[PDB]
Amino acid sequence: KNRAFLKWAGGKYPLLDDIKRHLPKGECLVEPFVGAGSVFLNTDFSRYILADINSDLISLYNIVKMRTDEYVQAARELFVPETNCAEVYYQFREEFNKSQDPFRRAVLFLYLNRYGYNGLCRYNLRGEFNVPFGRYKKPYFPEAELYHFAEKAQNAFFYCESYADSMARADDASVVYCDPPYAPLSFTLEQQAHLAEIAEGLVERHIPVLISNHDTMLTREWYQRAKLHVVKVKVDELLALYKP
Amino acid sequence: KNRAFLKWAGGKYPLLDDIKRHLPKGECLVEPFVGAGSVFLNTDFSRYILADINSDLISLYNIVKMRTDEYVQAARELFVPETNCAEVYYQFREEFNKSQDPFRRAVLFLYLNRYGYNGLCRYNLRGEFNVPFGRYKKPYFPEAELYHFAEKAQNAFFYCESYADSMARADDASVVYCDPPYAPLNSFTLEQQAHLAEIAEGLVERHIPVLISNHDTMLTREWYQRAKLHVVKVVDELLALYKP
Amino acid sequence: KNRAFLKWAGGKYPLLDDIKRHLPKGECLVEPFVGAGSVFLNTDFSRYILADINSDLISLYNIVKMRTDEYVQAARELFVPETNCAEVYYQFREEFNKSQDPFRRAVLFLYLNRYGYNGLCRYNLRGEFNVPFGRYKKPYFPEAELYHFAEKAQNAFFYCESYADSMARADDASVVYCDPPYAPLNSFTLEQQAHLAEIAEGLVERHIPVLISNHDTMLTREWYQRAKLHVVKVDELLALYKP
């Protein structure tokens, strides 16, 4: 059970067990929607292509991979409890939105993930990071998980681009896994259907794919050519396998 | 208690009785929203005017009335093991959507209702039927219900018109039951919901008795303010009686 | 707990204790959203300034303060049992909408609050009172609560005004308590929500304390970010601006 250094108070590491059963095997894993990394951190492919639209995330991750120690040392400073209050939370948020420094930004970013309302990552229309304070007991600085990430990252490349572009990188030796933002009970319905159409194209070329989403009509409509598996846990959750 | 041969799931049979209790006696029963026909099939009127805006439904019903065996024989062929899978379902759905033959359509329509998600009936903006494959196994061919429907049908006419047309056909020996699409907590608007109440008013003014069912709601209470109201538990169902 | 003569979407007074726990003290309490009065009616301030945009609410309250006995006599008539059917509710609703006499309108307003569905107060687009018949067994004529409200109104002013004007009457002796329409999970817009917190900030700077209640959500912690925050059992939030 390997933890992500970033919180997703989605709390979405239970699926992992069913994800791993259903996920085929291969040399490379492409993740067009990497987010916090849990699939990557709990699998053993020999390489990884890891992609996301969020350039803060990708920048952060290149920095953890290539500037490990300087980063880890710099970031821990920010976990002393002088910083566990609103006034300095709001102080850091502003610095972040003002900053032009990739490194300092990555550093503060981890703070806002951890002291932030629900570990949410959101932006306003103006592009400013938008989430408020979370008033959590005492946040844990994820030192161990940082080093794990960085070690495992030596077999990964990270890109900042949209699912369609990362999905074109896949090859006969690849396997794609997709965790798009969830279906209804910003990421449009036409994009959700475009993702399935791209997955259909990749089986025709012998490249396996597996997608996660909620269980709904919409979801079953888009994934109609996949083997479906329903997963229990708070409505159910679907996993759509496209196998050759 | 006789079952409909069309499954519905929502409004699935469960408050008949409460309707029977309040539904006045008469020579003829007018239903402007037959839908699946449950009331019609659990009621002993001398005759029936049964209507609905869904042209595929009314055509299926006419066919079942006039070609009973040719129909049961043909529809049975689709309720074998071979067909209980996504692959064939999307095949049948596309055939339906392309077909111009009423008989074949009406055969496929019943398959579609029993194998599709929740037995919904739904169309996209091009008028294509667009419910996806349903989850359950264990297909049931409704032979008995189909024959009972045909028998009962010799005392009915089926029209494909909208509520105001079919309600105008009611007379002094007639009784109207309305099961409009539900009120909220393409489709059937608020103006029509209030419209249906007026016609109902017109009708009792003429000594024709009308019964309407719906949700118990602020909005529902406002529209049916001139009926005697009855609340029934299972949210809450309202029944509104306009007695002369 | 002293009860309100009006039903407030069948008000439960669930926050009363905590509002009182956190509400600072002063000579005067300013309520920019009085609604039904529960905070007014459960506190011991030397003066109150009480305001709402709803003009039927404010006209009623002034009548109950000024012409008490005449009010209760005229209103009690509408609670006899001959009055508790749909035919009469709709006749009275119609009469209310067509009336131009404020006193008659206030008498009909209480009948509607007590005989109408879930005791809502709502208007359609023509500005007519919109709520249907609630069909209750036996509504309770709130005579005691009426008299209680009038005694207490003797130390109160009522204003028909939006939150920004009521809030600018506060002074260094005042305490301001805000119960705006709830944040999401016609309308009072989100611009207004942020606007209110920003007026709050202006006041705590001039040394006047302010306390705001709303649902606890992402948007409301953003809006009240310079307040001290108390959570309460969705969840409920009180925001306190302390000097």
Ligand SMILES: Nc1ncnc2c1ncn2[C@@H]1O[C@H](CN(CCc2c[nH]c3ccccc23)CC[C@H](N)C(=O)O)[C@@H](O)[C@H]1O
């Ligand atoms: N068009 C896109 N192409 C590729 N990635 C995209 C696209 N649009 C949105 N995304 C990304 O997809 C990722 C979504 N992930 C968001 C996870 C997340 C929550 N808090 C976080 C903090 C940091 C990083 C990730 C998360 C997956 C969401 C989850 N699967 C869900 O089902 O709701 C985000 O990082 C988005 O940036």
Ligand SMILES: Nc1ncnc2c1ncn2[C@@H]1O[C@H](CN(CCc2c[nH]c3ccccc23)CC[C@H](N)C(=O)O)[C@@H](O)[C@H]1O
């Ligand atoms: N203007 C209209 N005039 C007549 N009928 C109308 C009109 N508008 C809609 N309808 C029909 O009204 C019937 C609706 N009824 C539903 C029937 C139905 C749902 N799924 C089905 C599957 C097969 C057959 C019938 C149904 C009302 C159901 C319930 N009260 C609800 O709101 O869920 C449908 O058959 C529609 O076709």
Ligand SMILES: Nc1ncnc2c1ncn2[C@@H]1O[C@H](CN(CCc2c[nH]c3ccccc23)CC[C@H](N)C(=O)O)[C@@H](O)[C@H]1O
């Ligand atoms: N812009 C405004 N300025 C001042 N007051 C306003 C403004 N906008 C709305 N209001 C008033 O704010 C009050 C709202 N309150 C509810 C109204 C109410 C309850 N019982 C009643 C009986 C009669 C009339 C109104 C109420 C409290 C808000 C609560 N948290 C909720 O969302 O349910 C009403 O009196 C409104 O008229």
